[PDB]
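pipeline: protein-struct stage 2 | run 1193 | Lipase, class 3
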Amino acid sequence: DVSTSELNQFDFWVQYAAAAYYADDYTAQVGAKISCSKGNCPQVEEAGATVFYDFSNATITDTSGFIAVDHANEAVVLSFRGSYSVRNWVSDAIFVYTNPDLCDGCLADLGFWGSWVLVRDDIIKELKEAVSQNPGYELAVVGHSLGAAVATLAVADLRGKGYPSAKLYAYASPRVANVPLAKHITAQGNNYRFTHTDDPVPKLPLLAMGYVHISPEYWITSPNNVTVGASDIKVIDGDISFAGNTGTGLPSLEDFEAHKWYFMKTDAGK
């Protein structure tokens, strides 16, 4: 279980991930309000949050997202959407290690790290501007699905590049790195990683392939389309083969519906 306050926070930040799926939001003009036409980010719209910067998917990248400012919650928000070709990723994606220069012995998943390095330089300069314009604000990096994987690596990297207290909200994230990197990110703190029942996406890449998750795990045990109660989240303190989402078994495409239901229909805007 979790507290009502924690649950409120968890139900809230997922809505910025939900907005990340809307082309209207990641191609918005500077100063436009974030909006979810399918009605799945109401509390975001209620904050009045506006887009500072955004970046679109295109012929050269499957990653899109935005930097927005939330004056209600005093936060700069960096939101990532990855490729929405996720079923094909579960069924056929091959993984590859790479050395991201993050920590001693740390190796990251090449695809996710590559997606972050592609946007990193401009996002760092933009964040410097927006945080300077909002000095007392926290930085929250958020995403869902493959976007959550990019969010994780972005957070970890940014924490070594001037934002050590950056928060990470990674809904339905794959594993992104090996044991040393998972240990390094876990020790940075401020990590909120979510799984849902038997969602296959957080089960990949496999433990058997050398990858490990950031801890802890917030495992939502309630079904699809179900309101998440305070009693519907279990906190798992280590990434082991028999606990939480991974403990539900090896990944199966027949479980894929569980991937879309993380408090809301996160990808309704795709």
